[PDB]
Design an enzyme around this catalytic site. Sequence first.
Site, PDB file in Angstrom:
ATOM      1  N   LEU A 159       1.179  -1.288   0.148  1.00  0.00           N
ATOM      2  CA  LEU A 159      -0.055   0.181   0.145  1.00  0.00           C
ATOM      3  C   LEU A 159       0.774   1.323   0.324  1.00  0.00           C
ATOM      4  O   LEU A 159       0.695   2.378  -0.713  1.00  0.00           O
ATOM      5  CB  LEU A 159      -0.764   0.093   1.609  1.00  0.00           C
ATOM      6  N   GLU A 160       1.217   1.591   0.845  1.00  0.00           N
ATOM      7  CA  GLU A 160       2.809   1.938   0.698  1.00  0.00           C
ATOM      8  C   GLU A 160       3.529   2.513  -0.316  1.00  0.00           C
ATOM      9  O   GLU A 160       3.842   4.064  -0.940  1.00  0.00           O
ATOM     10  CB  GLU A 160       3.444   2.650   2.301  1.00  0.00           C
ATOM     11  N   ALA A 161       4.065   0.867  -0.825  1.00  0.00           N
ATOM     12  CA  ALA A 161       4.232   1.501  -1.913  1.00  0.00           C
ATOM     13  C   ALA A 161       3.790   1.428  -3.303  1.00  0.00           C
ATOM     14  O   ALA A 161       4.314   2.502  -4.030  1.00  0.00           O
ATOM     15  CB  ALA A 161       4.770  -0.193  -2.334  1.00  0.00           C
ATOM     16  N   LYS A 163       1.214   4.162  -3.035  1.00  0.00           N
ATOM     17  CA  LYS A 163       1.318   5.682  -2.479  1.00  0.00           C
ATOM     18  C   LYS A 163       2.633   6.341  -2.864  1.00  0.00           C
ATOM     19  O   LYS A 163       2.843   7.451  -3.799  1.00  0.00           O
ATOM     20  CB  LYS A 163       1.086   5.624  -0.881  1.00  0.00           C
TER      21      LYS A 163
END
Lengths: 247, 261
Positions: A159-161, A163
């Site tokens: 997810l942060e990847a 983002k």
Amino acid sequence: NLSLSQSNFSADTYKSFIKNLRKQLTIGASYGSAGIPILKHSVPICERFLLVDLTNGDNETITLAINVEDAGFAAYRAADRSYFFQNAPPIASYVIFTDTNQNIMNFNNTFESIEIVGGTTRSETPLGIMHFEASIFHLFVHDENYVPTSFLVLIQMVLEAAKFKFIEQKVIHSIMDMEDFTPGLAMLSLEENWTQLSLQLQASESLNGVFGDSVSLYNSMDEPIGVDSMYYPILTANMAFQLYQCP
Amino acid sequence: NEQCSPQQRTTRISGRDGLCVDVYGALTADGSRVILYPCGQQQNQQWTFYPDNTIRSLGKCLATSALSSGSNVVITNCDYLRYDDGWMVSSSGTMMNKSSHLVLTANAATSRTNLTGENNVFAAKQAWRIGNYVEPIVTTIIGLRHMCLEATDNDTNVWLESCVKNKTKQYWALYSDDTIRVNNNRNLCVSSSTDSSSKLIVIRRCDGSINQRWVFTPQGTISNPGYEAVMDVAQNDVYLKKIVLSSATDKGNGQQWTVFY
Ligand SMILES: *[C@@H]1O[C@H](CO)[C@@H](O[C@@H]2O[C@H](CO)[C@@H](O[C@@H]3O[C@H](CO)[C@@H](O)[C@H](O)[C@@H]3O)[C@H](O)[C@H]2NC(C)=O)[C@H](O)[C@H]1NC(C)=O
Ligand SMILES: *[C@@H]1O[C@H](CO)[C@@H](O)[C@H](O)[C@H]1NC(C)=O
Ligand SMILES: CO[C@H]1O[C@H](CO)[C@H](O)[C@H](O)[C@H]1O
């Protein structure tokens, strides 16, 4: 459902996985002057979740349900079982994993809540291929000892990847080199400020692309760079999408 | 949410060669001139942006001097400009007068060069970073097959090479004038071809030209907005050792880049 499996695994397929993840999260996205898509808001529950399958090398699969409003995990289903974060939308039980034995995890989907209960921070938690695999396993079996850390691994690696292209690049390097890493100030400061950056970037429509408040993003040398506008390539060419903050 | 409508922000503005927009001598009076000067903490480099599209230092608004191109940029009493639509700053950092279309420009790199209102051609001398952090951003530039842009042949050519942590010639300094410069030698800028027969991207001595202005777009391209094209790997083949300027297109992944800083 969108998928990333260990059989078809490499820097290239991971990059492809993230592109399609971004693309599907930003269907119907709004756009401002910055040109960074803003995620959808006040979405009917019945369509507020994007399902994503993840499979380790031992063919154990989990389906994760991503809230398309904020790009964070609301729940996941393994086999006939499913597990919900206690801050997942109240009605989420009636829309996803309905055909399962549903359970509530006793912590929120935030890094703060996960670290408090897990007893371990992101900077102590290594990331890479081996840890991606273990996380899928520990979530599939739901070993309560490792559920907190497994989410720290997969929230960041998926997810942060999605983002942040910088984070995506850290995971690409780790996959390509077969080299595990713990995130430093550069990666953590992006995660800390995804919501703040979204606010300021949308607020900056008012003030010629200049922010109401400054945001300190660190670089790989641990030097704090102050982003108080949309005119920094480390923000503009990094962040893939925003939380809806302003009309 | 009242934070969606912030009423003002005080910041700095840095452009050509990393030098800041500066009111010459911190002079109060109307028509006081605005110059390119080494960046510092002084009051006459502090610029407050407002919802009415004004940009203010010393309690007075930044403004172009004449209707036609060539003339200076000056601070003047704001009341003069309360029924004027003011500045629009484009996505790339082009600061433009709304009604006139003239843009903030630095015709030379020298300290105390007079900033001026000229016709926009998307030159590096017309590119500006609005922000308090004025320093060049040191970074690698990762592209096709997860490889790094490296300065090669004594900082004359640029092509893709396997990324090596801390390898000097794979680090680049991103300046407030949208130039990409060799980190080991910040007199040199990455440049589109000056020869009309070649599309090959090179390293040359920095000159504020259209060739050296590069915009890292949110869609992952490195754009030269003046020539309406983007950085691309020759034939999507890194072993050809050629980076070229090409019209934007989704065919291949040669026009996709990541800034890893
Ligand atoms: C952008 O450029 C435009 C046009 O160059 C500027 O508009 C001009 O602004 C000045 C100052 O407000 C206007 O001034 C007044 O003119 C009368 C005579 O007509 C004079 O008696 C007053 O003392 C005063 O000088 C000027 O007429 C106006 N020109 C046009 C074509 O409207 C504008 O100020 C610039 N904006 C910025 C922020 O640079
Ligand atoms: C989870 O978020 C809710 C608000 O949605 C908050 O009330 C609660 O305190 C959070 N979880 C914990 C354990 O604090
Ligand atoms: C000598 O310094 C003073 O004048 C120069 C121009 O000569 C600059 O405007 C600077 O900001 C100001 O403090």
